Coordinates of C-alpha atoms in Angstrom, one line a residue:
Chain A
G1 CA 5.2 0.8 23.6
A2 CA 3.1 2.2 20.8
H3 CA 3.7 5.4 18.9
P4 CA 0.6 7.5 18.3
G5 CA 0.1 7.7 14.6
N6 CA 1.3 4.2 13.8
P7 CA -1.0 1.3 13.1
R8 CA -1.6 -1.0 16.1
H9 CA -2.0 -4.1 14.0
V10 CA -0.3 -4.6 10.5
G11 CA -1.4 -7.4 8.2
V12 CA 0.8 -8.3 5.3
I13 CA -0.2 -10.6 2.4
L14 CA 3.1 -12.2 1.4
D15 CA 2.5 -12.3 -2.3
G16 CA 4.9 -12.8 -5.1
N17 CA 7.1 -15.8 -4.0
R18 CA 6.1 -17.9 -7.1
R19 CA 6.8 -15.0 -9.5
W20 CA 10.1 -14.2 -7.7
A21 CA 11.2 -17.9 -8.0
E22 CA 10.5 -18.0 -11.8
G23 CA 12.2 -14.7 -12.4
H24 CA 15.3 -15.8 -10.5
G25 CA 15.5 -19.4 -11.7
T26 CA 15.0 -20.8 -8.2
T27 CA 12.8 -23.4 -6.6
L28 CA 9.6 -22.4 -4.7
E29 CA 11.2 -23.6 -1.4
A30 CA 14.0 -21.2 -2.0
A31 CA 11.6 -18.3 -2.5
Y32 CA 9.8 -19.1 0.7
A33 CA 13.1 -19.3 2.6
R34 CA 13.9 -15.8 1.4
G35 CA 10.3 -14.8 2.2
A36 CA 10.8 -16.0 5.8
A37 CA 13.9 -13.9 6.0
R38 CA 11.8 -10.9 4.9
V39 CA 9.3 -11.8 7.7
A40 CA 12.2 -11.6 10.1
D41 CA 13.1 -8.2 8.6
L42 CA 9.5 -7.0 8.9
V43 CA 9.1 -7.8 12.6
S44 CA 12.4 -6.1 13.4
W45 CA 11.2 -2.9 11.6
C46 CA 7.9 -3.2 13.5
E47 CA 9.6 -3.5 16.8
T48 CA 11.6 -0.3 16.2
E49 CA 8.3 1.4 15.5
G50 CA 6.6 -0.1 18.6
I51 CA 4.1 -2.0 16.4
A52 CA 3.3 -5.1 18.5
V53 CA 0.7 -7.0 16.5
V54 CA 1.7 -8.4 13.0
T55 CA -0.3 -10.9 11.0
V56 CA 1.3 -12.4 7.8
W57 CA -0.6 -14.5 5.3
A58 CA 1.9 -17.0 4.0
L59 CA -0.3 -19.7 2.4
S60 CA -3.9 -19.7 1.1
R61 CA -6.1 -22.7 1.1
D62 CA -6.6 -22.1 -2.7
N63 CA -2.9 -22.4 -3.2
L64 CA -2.8 -25.8 -1.5
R65 CA -3.6 -27.0 -5.0
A66 CA 1.8 -31.6 -1.7
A67 CA 5.5 -32.3 -1.8
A68 CA 5.8 -28.6 -2.6
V69 CA 3.5 -27.5 0.3
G70 CA 5.6 -29.5 2.7
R71 CA 8.9 -27.9 1.5
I72 CA 7.3 -24.5 1.7
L73 CA 6.1 -25.1 5.3
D74 CA 9.5 -26.4 6.3
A75 CA 11.3 -23.5 4.8
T76 CA 9.0 -21.2 6.6
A77 CA 9.5 -23.0 10.0
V78 CA 13.3 -22.9 9.6
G79 CA 13.2 -19.3 8.5
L80 CA 11.3 -18.2 11.6
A81 CA 13.9 -19.8 13.9
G82 CA 15.6 -16.4 14.5
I83 CA 12.4 -14.7 15.4
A84 CA 11.7 -17.5 17.9
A85 CA 15.2 -17.3 19.3
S86 CA 14.8 -13.5 19.8
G87 CA 12.1 -13.9 22.5
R88 CA 10.5 -10.7 21.2
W89 CA 7.5 -12.3 19.4
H90 CA 4.9 -14.8 20.4
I91 CA 4.3 -16.7 17.1
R92 CA 0.8 -18.1 16.7
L93 CA -0.7 -20.0 13.7
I94 CA -4.0 -19.3 12.1
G95 CA -5.8 -21.1 9.3
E96 CA -7.0 -24.7 8.8
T97 CA -3.7 -26.3 9.6
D98 CA -5.3 -29.7 9.7
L99 CA -5.4 -29.4 5.9
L100 CA -1.6 -29.4 5.7
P101 CA 0.7 -32.5 5.6
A102 CA 1.1 -33.6 9.1
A103 CA 4.9 -33.8 9.6
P104 CA 5.7 -30.3 8.1
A105 CA 2.7 -28.9 10.0
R106 CA 4.0 -30.3 13.3
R107 CA 7.4 -28.8 12.7
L108 CA 5.8 -25.4 12.0
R109 CA 3.6 -25.8 15.1
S110 CA 6.7 -26.8 17.1
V111 CA 8.5 -23.6 16.2
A112 CA 5.5 -21.5 17.2
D113 CA 4.8 -23.4 20.4
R114 CA 8.3 -22.6 21.7
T115 CA 7.5 -18.9 21.6
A116 CA 4.6 -18.9 24.1
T117 CA 6.6 -16.6 26.4
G118 CA 7.7 -14.3 23.6
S119 CA 7.0 -10.6 24.4
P120 CA 5.9 -7.8 23.6
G121 CA 5.1 -8.8 20.1
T122 CA 2.5 -11.1 18.6
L123 CA 3.2 -12.6 15.1
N124 CA 0.2 -14.4 13.6
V125 CA 1.2 -16.7 10.7
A126 CA -1.7 -17.7 8.4
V127 CA -1.4 -21.0 6.6
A128 CA -4.1 -22.8 4.7
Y129 CA -6.2 -19.7 5.6
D130 CA -9.4 -18.6 3.7
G131 CA -11.6 -15.6 4.6
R132 CA -14.9 -17.3 3.6
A133 CA -13.9 -20.3 5.6
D134 CA -13.1 -18.0 8.6
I135 CA -16.6 -16.5 8.4
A136 CA -18.2 -20.0 7.9
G137 CA -16.4 -21.1 11.1
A138 CA -18.2 -18.4 13.1
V139 CA -21.5 -20.2 12.1
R140 CA -20.2 -23.6 13.2
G141 CA -19.0 -22.0 16.4
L142 CA -22.3 -20.5 17.3
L143 CA -24.1 -23.8 16.5
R144 CA -22.0 -25.8 18.9
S145 CA -22.5 -23.1 21.6
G146 CA -26.3 -23.8 21.5
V147 CA -27.2 -13.2 17.7
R148 CA -25.3 -9.9 17.6
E149 CA -22.4 -8.8 15.4
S150 CA -20.1 -9.1 18.4
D151 CA -21.2 -12.8 18.7
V152 CA -20.2 -13.5 15.1
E153 CA -16.8 -11.9 15.8
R154 CA -16.2 -14.0 19.0
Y155 CA -16.7 -17.2 17.1
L156 CA -14.5 -16.4 14.0
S157 CA -11.8 -19.0 13.6
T158 CA -9.5 -15.8 13.9
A159 CA -11.4 -14.5 17.0
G160 CA -8.0 -14.1 18.8
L161 CA -7.0 -11.4 16.2
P162 CA -8.1 -7.8 16.7
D163 CA -8.9 -5.3 14.0
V164 CA -6.2 -4.7 11.4
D165 CA -5.2 -1.0 10.9
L166 CA -3.0 -1.4 7.8
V167 CA -2.9 -4.1 5.2
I168 CA 0.1 -4.4 2.9
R169 CA 0.0 -6.6 -0.1
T170 CA 3.0 -7.1 -2.3
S171 CA 3.5 -8.1 -6.0
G172 CA 1.3 -5.2 -7.3
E173 CA -1.9 -7.2 -6.8
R174 CA -4.6 -4.8 -5.8
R175 CA -6.8 -7.3 -4.1
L176 CA -7.5 -8.6 -0.5
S177 CA -8.3 -12.2 -1.6
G178 CA -10.4 -12.6 1.5
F179 CA -7.7 -11.8 4.0
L180 CA -9.4 -11.5 7.4
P181 CA -12.6 -10.0 6.1
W182 CA -14.0 -9.2 9.5
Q183 CA -10.9 -7.5 11.0
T184 CA -9.8 -5.6 7.9
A185 CA -13.2 -4.0 7.2
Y186 CA -11.8 -0.6 8.2
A187 CA -8.1 -1.2 7.5
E188 CA -6.1 1.2 5.3
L189 CA -5.1 -0.8 2.2
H190 CA -1.6 -0.4 0.8
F191 CA -0.3 -2.0 -2.4
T192 CA 3.5 -2.5 -2.8
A193 CA 4.8 -3.3 -6.2
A194 CA 7.8 -5.4 -5.1
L195 CA 7.5 -9.2 -4.9
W196 CA 7.5 -10.4 -1.3
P197 CA 11.1 -11.9 -1.3
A198 CA 12.4 -8.5 -2.3
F199 CA 10.4 -6.5 0.2
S200 CA 12.6 -3.6 1.3
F201 CA 12.9 -1.1 4.2
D202 CA 11.9 1.5 1.7
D203 CA 8.7 -0.4 0.9
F204 CA 8.0 -0.7 4.7
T205 CA 8.6 3.1 5.1
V206 CA 6.4 4.0 2.2
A207 CA 3.6 1.8 3.6
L208 CA 3.9 3.3 7.1
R209 CA 4.0 6.9 5.8
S210 CA 0.9 6.3 3.7
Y211 CA -0.9 5.2 6.9
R212 CA 0.3 8.2 8.9
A213 CA -0.7 10.6 6.1
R214 CA -4.3 9.3 5.6
Chain B
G1 CA -23.8 -8.0 -24.1
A2 CA -20.5 -8.1 -22.2
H3 CA -17.0 -7.3 -23.5
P4 CA -14.4 -9.8 -22.5
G5 CA -11.8 -8.0 -20.5
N6 CA -14.4 -5.8 -18.7
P7 CA -15.6 -6.4 -15.2
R8 CA -19.0 -8.1 -15.0
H9 CA -20.0 -6.4 -11.8
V10 CA -18.7 -3.0 -10.7
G11 CA -19.2 -1.8 -7.1
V12 CA -18.7 1.9 -6.3
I13 CA -18.4 3.4 -2.9
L14 CA -19.8 6.9 -3.4
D15 CA -17.5 8.7 -1.0
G16 CA -16.8 12.4 -0.7
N17 CA -20.2 14.1 -0.7
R18 CA -19.7 15.7 2.7
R19 CA -16.2 17.0 1.8
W20 CA -17.5 18.3 -1.5
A21 CA -20.4 20.1 0.1
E22 CA -18.0 21.8 2.6
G23 CA -15.5 22.8 -0.2
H24 CA -18.3 24.3 -2.3
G25 CA -20.3 26.0 0.4
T26 CA -23.4 23.8 -0.3
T27 CA -25.8 21.8 1.7
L28 CA -25.5 18.0 2.1
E29 CA -28.7 17.5 0.1
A30 CA -27.2 19.5 -2.8
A31 CA -24.1 17.2 -2.8
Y32 CA -26.3 14.1 -2.9
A33 CA -28.3 15.6 -5.7
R34 CA -25.1 16.0 -7.7
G35 CA -24.0 12.6 -6.5
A36 CA -27.1 11.1 -8.0
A37 CA -26.4 12.8 -11.3
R38 CA -23.0 11.1 -11.2
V39 CA -24.7 7.7 -10.6
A40 CA -26.7 8.5 -13.8
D41 CA -23.5 9.2 -15.6
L42 CA -21.9 6.1 -14.2
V43 CA -24.6 3.7 -15.4
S44 CA -24.6 5.4 -18.9
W45 CA -20.9 4.8 -19.2
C46 CA -21.3 1.2 -18.0
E47 CA -24.0 0.5 -20.6
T48 CA -21.7 1.7 -23.4
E49 CA -19.2 -0.8 -22.1
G50 CA -21.7 -3.6 -21.7
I51 CA -21.3 -3.7 -17.9
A52 CA -24.7 -4.8 -16.7
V53 CA -24.4 -5.2 -12.9
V54 CA -23.6 -2.1 -10.9
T55 CA -23.7 -1.7 -7.1
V56 CA -23.4 1.7 -5.5
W57 CA -23.0 2.3 -1.8
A58 CA -24.8 5.6 -1.1
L59 CA -25.3 5.5 2.7
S60 CA -23.7 3.6 5.5
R61 CA -25.4 2.6 8.7
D62 CA -22.6 4.3 10.6
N63 CA -23.4 7.6 8.8
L64 CA -27.0 7.5 9.9
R65 CA -25.6 9.3 12.9
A66 CA -32.4 12.4 10.7
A67 CA -33.8 15.4 9.0
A68 CA -30.5 15.3 7.0
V69 CA -30.9 11.6 6.2
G70 CA -34.4 12.2 4.9
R71 CA -33.3 15.0 2.6
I72 CA -30.4 12.9 1.3
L73 CA -32.7 9.9 0.6
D74 CA -35.1 12.2 -1.2
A75 CA -32.4 13.9 -3.3
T76 CA -31.2 10.4 -4.2
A77 CA -34.7 9.2 -5.2
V78 CA -35.3 12.3 -7.3
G79 CA -31.9 12.1 -8.9
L80 CA -32.5 8.5 -10.0
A81 CA -35.7 9.4 -11.8
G82 CA -33.9 9.6 -15.2
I83 CA -32.3 6.2 -14.8
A84 CA -35.8 4.8 -14.0
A85 CA -37.4 6.6 -17.0
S86 CA -34.7 5.1 -19.3
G87 CA -35.9 1.5 -18.8
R88 CA -32.3 0.3 -19.1
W89 CA -31.8 -0.5 -15.4
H90 CA -33.7 -2.5 -12.8
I91 CA -33.0 -0.6 -9.6
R92 CA -32.9 -2.6 -6.4
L93 CA -32.3 -1.5 -2.8
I94 CA -30.0 -3.2 -0.4
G95 CA -29.2 -2.5 3.2
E96 CA -31.3 -2.3 6.4
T97 CA -33.9 0.1 4.9
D98 CA -36.2 -0.3 7.9
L99 CA -33.6 1.8 9.8
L100 CA -34.4 4.9 7.6
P101 CA -37.2 7.5 8.1
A102 CA -40.3 5.9 6.7
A103 CA -41.6 8.5 4.2
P104 CA -38.3 9.2 2.4
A105 CA -37.6 5.5 2.4
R106 CA -40.9 4.8 0.8
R107 CA -40.3 7.4 -1.9
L108 CA -36.9 5.7 -2.6
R109 CA -38.6 2.3 -2.7
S110 CA -41.3 3.7 -5.0
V111 CA -38.7 4.8 -7.6
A112 CA -36.9 1.5 -7.4
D113 CA -40.2 -0.5 -7.6
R114 CA -41.2 1.2 -10.8
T115 CA -38.1 -0.3 -12.6
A116 CA -38.9 -4.0 -12.1
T117 CA -39.0 -4.4 -15.9
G118 CA -35.8 -2.4 -16.5
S119 CA -33.4 -4.4 -18.7
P120 CA -30.5 -5.3 -19.3
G121 CA -28.9 -3.6 -16.4
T122 CA -29.2 -4.1 -12.6
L123 CA -28.4 -1.2 -10.4
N124 CA -28.2 -2.1 -6.7
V125 CA -28.3 0.9 -4.3
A126 CA -27.0 0.3 -0.8
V127 CA -28.5 2.5 1.9
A128 CA -28.1 2.0 5.6
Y129 CA -25.8 -0.9 4.6
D130 CA -23.1 -2.4 6.8
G131 CA -20.9 -5.4 5.9
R132 CA -20.7 -6.9 9.4
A133 CA -24.5 -6.6 9.6
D134 CA -24.7 -8.3 6.2
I135 CA -22.6 -11.2 7.5
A136 CA -24.6 -11.4 10.7
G137 CA -27.8 -11.6 8.7
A138 CA -26.5 -14.9 7.1
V139 CA -26.5 -16.3 10.6
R140 CA -30.1 -15.2 11.4
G141 CA -31.1 -16.6 8.0
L142 CA -29.6 -20.1 8.6
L143 CA -31.2 -20.1 12.1
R144 CA -34.7 -19.5 10.8
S145 CA -34.1 -22.1 8.1
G146 CA -33.8 -24.8 10.8
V147 CA -23.1 -25.7 7.0
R148 CA -21.1 -25.0 3.8
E149 CA -19.6 -21.7 2.7
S150 CA -22.2 -21.7 -0.1
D151 CA -24.9 -21.9 2.5
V152 CA -23.5 -18.7 4.2
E153 CA -23.5 -17.0 0.9
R154 CA -27.1 -18.0 0.2
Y155 CA -28.3 -16.4 3.4
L156 CA -26.5 -13.1 3.2
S157 CA -28.8 -10.1 3.3
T158 CA -27.1 -9.4 -0.1
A159 CA -27.5 -13.0 -1.4
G160 CA -29.1 -11.5 -4.6
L161 CA -25.7 -9.9 -5.5
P162 CA -23.0 -11.9 -7.3
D163 CA -19.3 -11.5 -6.9
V164 CA -17.9 -8.0 -7.5
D165 CA -15.1 -7.8 -10.1
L166 CA -14.0 -4.2 -9.5
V167 CA -14.5 -1.9 -6.6
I168 CA -14.0 1.9 -7.1
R169 CA -13.9 4.1 -4.0
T170 CA -13.7 7.9 -4.4
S171 CA -12.3 10.7 -2.2
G172 CA -8.8 9.2 -1.9
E173 CA -9.9 6.9 0.9
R174 CA -8.0 3.6 0.6
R175 CA -10.4 1.5 2.6
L176 CA -13.4 -0.8 1.8
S177 CA -15.2 0.1 5.1
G178 CA -16.9 -3.3 5.0
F179 CA -18.5 -2.9 1.5
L180 CA -19.9 -6.4 0.6
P181 CA -17.2 -8.4 2.4
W182 CA -18.3 -11.7 0.9
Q183 CA -18.7 -10.6 -2.8
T184 CA -15.6 -8.3 -2.9
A185 CA -13.2 -10.9 -1.5
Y186 CA -11.5 -11.2 -4.9
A187 CA -12.4 -7.9 -6.4
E188 CA -9.8 -5.6 -7.9
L189 CA -9.7 -2.5 -5.7
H190 CA -9.3 0.9 -7.3
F191 CA -9.0 4.2 -5.4
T192 CA -10.0 7.4 -7.2
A193 CA -8.8 10.7 -5.8
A194 CA -11.8 12.8 -6.9
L195 CA -14.8 13.4 -4.6
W196 CA -17.9 11.5 -5.7
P197 CA -19.9 14.6 -6.9
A198 CA -17.0 15.4 -9.2
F199 CA -16.4 11.9 -10.5
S200 CA -15.5 12.2 -14.2
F201 CA -15.4 10.1 -17.3
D202 CA -11.6 10.2 -17.0
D203 CA -11.9 8.7 -13.5
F204 CA -14.1 6.0 -14.9
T205 CA -11.7 5.3 -17.8
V206 CA -8.7 5.1 -15.5
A207 CA -10.5 2.6 -13.3
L208 CA -11.6 0.4 -16.1
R209 CA -8.1 0.5 -17.7
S210 CA -6.6 -0.5 -14.3
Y211 CA -8.9 -3.6 -14.3
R212 CA -8.1 -4.6 -17.8
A213 CA -4.4 -4.2 -17.2
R214 CA -4.2 -6.4 -14.1

């Protein structure tokens, strides 16, 4: 169960993999493999704190700008295998996944689909996600249904995600880049200097303490 | 004209007036009078830097929760009189102004309307504004017109405002609170500790330097 004082839903923008790869001489796929290991660390630290909703933004639509995207999706799917095997997290995908290459996308979907009984946590993984597209989907949704603010919310492409209490973005970038514009409207915003593949327990602690101290 | 390296459009969330009033023993109206003097300072500093679009969020819809709102609107209208007399800024109102008391709202509208020839600056003043209502208005707008992301943007209640390059929020609050969700998606986000009535040229300089250094 939850600890009063902690955020109920933490959103993390997994920024810095490209810079980390260049600084270490590695491939992009190798940075996303390490980044997936940091997602596994993150959800472990969240479970210790009773934080049961976690959304991570792994891939933007803008950063789909083919072979690389496939390898990155596959390193992410493989690196989530331990989370899946734990049974502690229901993994769900968000974003316009039909924009991704079909075979790597199916393998990522296959990992997530095997966690439908995972409990008590929910881990939302955003790939090919864009906030303006999310908002635009609420319009297409209302149209096909045949207007209050709560009706826009219900038709967001991310309507299954509740409000975000704390956003963490790594790499020192002080921007949201359209991450869940509706649900983060009132989120505490924390900026971590470290690149995502190097995200540490100290970084996690500093972020949580900043939320609790607000 | 503009200086390369500077933000083209600065949005400032004018936070801290209530806390400032309590800490100084003053009325809320007195804090908003001082806050309006800081808006006059802000636009002067922006003109020196060639920054020609400035949006300030003075009043949220949530913080409409009558006599007080009237006095606050009137202190704001009076405190903008010098900006109006300068001729350097076209003042425009945004937000659901029909939610405000009618006589103070008309006096604020009257100040803004007298600046239609102001040039080269544009100063947008948000009162009774809410970001989720802004987004919801884009739906009502498309409906009455009879869908691309650019069509949602065109029908925002704030469709006359372009993208924000730098957001400044005072009072140490590390939140956007739904300020222009569409236009701030890719804005640099700067958090200033000072309460808005105490906002200083050092605070302005630190914010601009943070943008230039990104």
